[PDB]
Paper text:
Two enzymes, peptidylglycine α-hydroxylating monooxygenase (PHM; EC 1.14.17.3) and peptidyl-α-hydroxyglycine α-amidating lyase (PAL; EC 4.3.2.5) working sequentially are the only proteins known to catalyze this reaction. PHM, a two Cu enzyme, catalyzes the stereospecific hydroxylation of the glycine Cα of peptidylglycine substrates. Crystallographic data on apo wild-type PHM and on several crystal forms of three CuH mutants (H107A, H108A, and H172A) presented here show that the copper ions are required not only for the catalytic steps but also for substrate binding and for locking the overall conformation of PHM in a configuration that is catalytically active.
Even though the molecule does not contain copper in the CuH site, copper at the CuM site has the same coordination and geometry as the wild-type. The N- and C-subdomains come closer by a small displacement (<0.5 Å). More surprising, although it has no copper in the CuH site, the conformation of the two remaining histidines in this site, His 107 and His 108, is almost unmodified from that of wild-type PHM and the CuM site retains the same coordination of the copper observed in wild-type PHM.
Author numbering: 46 to 48, 51 to 306, 311 to 355
Write the structure that this text describes.
């Protein structure tokens, strides 16, 4: 359980990093705790594997981000305060009773160097815990496999977030549409995660190419928000449009909710050939709203 060393070298090029809560005593149900772990190398390195070290009963949710400024410098903190004060580049999400996302063979996230993130920030959410267990420190976390051997495919995140959108009170279905033109080298989408708050019914993401929608994925965002795998990975390519839709319900809500708060985020996890690769992309617009008249019917079907 509690108390390998922080850094464990493996061959010339490889090392393991144990990212572990420093003996925390979670009081209270659904409390999100955070710790940072600086990268031991200044040079470019590649995260090529992950291994959860989650306590069985206590832990329901773990996230790992890549970023440059962690919100606290303390040995741990509460992620209510924040994760990183800058852009938090998400790398790994784990839920209990969830298919954990596993990097395809030659894929790694690019960290360190001038570009890449310097810190990992770990986020561990605990269940109901409860009972008469205050005499218990927890060291939950995850081990990361890093190497300085350059990888031929580089993983990254395409984040789609809604910003315009107002949820009127009482309307049973409200749609939040997001769309950008893709204008880079090809990316290959292998997983997705969806974030909303209370009112999300379902989030869906698509590549649209010559007016044909291909599914990237869809999920009820009230399920655990891990990275779900893509059945067959989707190449997204120059002149494709990425388009997302969230269905909210303002049933019972007392007044207008904006995006008292709500979010629609789609995390699209991809790989790109190392030379043309980018670690991060974003859409926060709906350039092609007219298009959504076309959207497959399956995108408005609830996932209860
Ligand atoms: Cu949120």
């Amino acid at each position: 359980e509690c108390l390998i060393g922080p850094v464990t070298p493996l061959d010339a090029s490889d090392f393991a990093l144990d990212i572990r809560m420093p003996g925390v005593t979670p009081k209270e149900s659904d409390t999100y705790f955070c710790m940072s772990m600086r990268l031991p190398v200044d040079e470019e390195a590649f995260v090529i594997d992950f291994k959860p070290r989650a306590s069985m009963d206590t832990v329901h949710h773990m996230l790992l981000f890549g970023c440059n400024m962690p919100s606290s410098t303390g040995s741990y903190w509460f992620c209510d305060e924040g994760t990183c004060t800058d852009k938090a580049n998400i790398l790994y999400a784990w839920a209990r009773n969830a298919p954990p996302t596993r990097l395809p063979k030659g894929v790694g996230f690019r960290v360190g160097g001038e570009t890449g993130s310097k810190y990992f920030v770990l986020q561990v959410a605990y269940g109901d815990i409860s009972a008469f267990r205050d005499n218990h420190k927890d060291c939950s976390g995850v081990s990361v496999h890093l190497t300085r051997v350059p990888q031929p495919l580089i993983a990254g995140m395409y984040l789609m977030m809604s910003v315009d959108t107002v949820i009127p009170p009482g309307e049973k279905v409200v749609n939040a549409d997001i769309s950008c033109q893709y204008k880079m080298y090809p990316m290959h989408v292998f997983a997705y995660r969806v974030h909303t708050h209370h009112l999300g019914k379902v989030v869906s993401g698509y590549r649209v190419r010559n007016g044909q929608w291909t599914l990237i994925g869809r999920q009820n965002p009230q399920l655990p928000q891990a990275f779900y795998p893509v059945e067959h990975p989707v190449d997204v390519t120059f002149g494709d449009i990425l388009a997302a839709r969230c269905v909210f319900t303002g049933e019972g809500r007392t007044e207008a909710t904006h995006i008292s708060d709500e979010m629609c985020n789609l995390y699209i996890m991809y790989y790109m050939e190392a030379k043309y690769a980018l670690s991060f992309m974003t859409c926060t617009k709906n350039v092609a709203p007219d298009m959504f008249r076309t959207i497959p019917a399956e995108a408005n079907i609830p996932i209860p």
